[PDB]
């Protein structure tokens, strides 16, 4: 227990969890921006 | 003229972000074996 607490293992786990959640949120935002959830947005793609 | 039915609209991921993939804190399950005493039941009365 002293060795676990000496290496701030729970803190590193929390930081990794937060960074993973941030990365997942960014990836979800990017996917929502890329994927078209509407027919017209696809048709507008033809205009490009 | 283009089709109007999609399945991206059925997926919650393409609509709202989902910060999944969480990491539990680094802990340890502490479980100690009980102290089993038996000298109180039997008493060796024989000299060796």
Curated annotation (Swiss-Prot), chain B:
Coiled coil: none annotated. The gene is APOB. The chain holds residues 2691 to 2738 of 4563 of the full protein. Apolipoprotein B is a major protein constituent of chylomicrons (apo B-48), LDL (apo B-100) and VLDL (apo B-100). Apo B-100 functions as a recognition signal for the cellular binding and internalization of LDL particles by the apoB/E receptor. Interacts with PCSK9. Interacts with MTTP. Interacts with AUP1. Interacts with CIDEB. This is Apolipoprotein B-100. It is found in: Cytoplasm; Secreted; Lipid droplet. It is linked to Hypobetalipoproteinemia, familial, 1: A disorder of lipid metabolism characterized by less than 5th percentile age- and sex-specific levels of low density lipoproteins, and dietary fat malabsorption. Clinical presentation may vary from no symptoms to severe gastrointestinal and neurological dysfunction similar to abetalipoproteinemia. Palmitoylated; structural requirement for proper assembly of the hydrophobic core of the lipoprotein particle. Induction: Up-regulated in response to enterovirus 71 (EV71) infection (at protein level). It comes from the Eukaryota.
